[PDB]
């Protein structure tokens, strides 16, 4: 403090080194004091909450698979970023290259036609051959779930998948190939958390088979993210131009 100082130290510095100094300057008449950090910042606390992933290569939020045919629902974190929205789970993982967690899915699906039904949900650990046309006997060895779905609609279910990847760290972006000879550039099919293949069933087996509709929430746990990348762009606000400078920094004056 002391108020008026002739000799007080300068605020000059250098930001050219990679490291940036953010410590507060000791200005006179100012008592700068630290603050405790509230625990919404830590990752493992912030990613433990469910969020909605974009389904398929594109065309989120929901996927509609016709009856009698299973959809494989790839869990590649690289497939999510394709056609990824600016805001969502999709674009948050774009900040880290490598992530490791036990991915907990909760998926819900609503059958428009009115009869009760059962989905058979299986998890094929990476990598595992997905049968081209799944059969109840073949699909079953992997791991089982039987989801009774309410006749009207909206029957949920949750899952807990441990971390099976042999990559140690699954990349959210990969620059290079996969096959030695083949192409498949820019992605790796063995880094991820299995696949969920699911085959619907109907006992009545009525005509007008129709199509089921679903969407799923995904929340990591025991999360670890090894190297950062810059977050995606957020569209800026419009310029009011009536009275500027109230919001939106002016410049070039």
């Amino acid at each position: 403090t002391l108020t008026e100082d002739l000799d007080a130290p300068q605020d000059t510095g250098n930001i050219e080194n990679g490291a940036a100094d953010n410590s507060p300057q000791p200005r006179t008449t100012f008592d700068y004091t630290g603050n405790p950090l509230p625990p919404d910042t830590k990752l493992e606390n912030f990613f433990s909450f469910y969020r909605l992933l974009p389904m398929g290569g594109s065309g989120a939020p929901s996927l509609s698979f016709p009856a009698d045919e299973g959809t494989i629902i790839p869990l590649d974190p690289i497939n999510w970023l394709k056609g990824a929205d600016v805001s969502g789970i999709a674009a948050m993982l774009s900040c880290f290259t490598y992530i490791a967690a036990d991915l907990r899915i909760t998926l819900r699906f609503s059958n428009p036609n009115d009869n009760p039904a059962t989905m058979l949900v299986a998890f094929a650990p990476p990598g595992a051959t997905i049968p081209l046309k799944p059969t109840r006997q073949m699909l079953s060895n992997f791991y089982m779930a039987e989801v009774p779905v309410s006749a009207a609609t909206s029957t949920m279910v949750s899952f807990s998948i441990p971390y099976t990847s042999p990559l140690s760290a699954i990349p959210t972006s990969y620059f290079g190939w996969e096959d030695w000879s083949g192409t498949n550039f820019g992605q790796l099919s063995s880094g991820s958390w299995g696949n969920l293949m699911l085959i619907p069933s109907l006992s009545v087996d009525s005509a007008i088979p129709f199509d089921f509709q679903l969407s799923c929430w995904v929340a990591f746990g025991n999360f670890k993210a090894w190297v950062p990348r810059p977050p995606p762009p957020l569209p800026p606000l419009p310029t009011p131009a009536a009275n500027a400078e109230r919001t939106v920094a002016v410049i070039k004056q």
């Binding site: 130290p9 625990p39 090894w226």
Partner: protein
Amino acid sequence: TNIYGNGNNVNTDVGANGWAPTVSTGLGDGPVSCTPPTPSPGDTEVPPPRKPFTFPAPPTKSGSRFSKWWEPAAAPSSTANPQPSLIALNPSATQSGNASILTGSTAPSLLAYPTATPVPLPNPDEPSQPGPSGDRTWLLDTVTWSQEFTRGWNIAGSNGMQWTGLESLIFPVSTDTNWTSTSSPTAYPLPFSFVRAYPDSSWAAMYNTHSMWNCGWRVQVTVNGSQFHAGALILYMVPEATTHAIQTARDNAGFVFPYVILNLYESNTATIEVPYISPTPNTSSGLHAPWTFYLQVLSPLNPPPSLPTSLSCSIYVTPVDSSFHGLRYLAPQ
């Protein structure tokens, strides 16, 4: 209160405990989880240059565990001191295997990420590492700087891969088809564009026939403008990703990577020290180039009038603590 209140400080299960006798019990079920394997020994090599190469695990016991049924029994930047402008002397030097680079004025130099601890290798073999050659400082293409480049122009020499080359590169590697086009090139991936232009060097001789390679990288650029020039540059040294996901015509938040602004005001030089970040201990050869080195313009250099508009610069790239594992017939790349 035993095995309860897990992942405290939040109303959720954070998987604080990998395993407990309690979880997965018939009475109640919690989410599953994992624990580290410790695949006993192996030439403990992971990140340069902390790699000892000595195997902690006993070698040659090959004990096994389960009993076979056919055997009877068996067993800075602190404001305390501010770096002066380029007028003041302030000597510095950064050496390497043999070649070394002197500098005057102020040279910003950093080590991007602190060196991680070692981890046991999956494979059993002895890594073959060569002292220079394969060390020192190799000189990549000297790129010309020009005045007409606006902010974020991605200047690069003749050895860089072109923009469209960063997508759909093709096989195998250098076809010369993606490296020659009108207006190029945006930037050079570090592993791929180092072998190119340096087949003779041993590092080059290696990395062809050795399959998996392990190197930390350090890149250095040198620009000396006259006391009257004004401008800036950035060295991103971006980890692996397509440019489209990394940056598109924006580069506004791009300082999250390592950067070390050149800032032709007070500096002639910049370096970066990068330990290599890749999944699995060792990347495969001929594919998967982890680091990519972009060089960008913060502000257009406007030279003193009546003097030439162009200005010249070079880029020095070198490995750190290289290693290799496994042999095979020569592969072009």
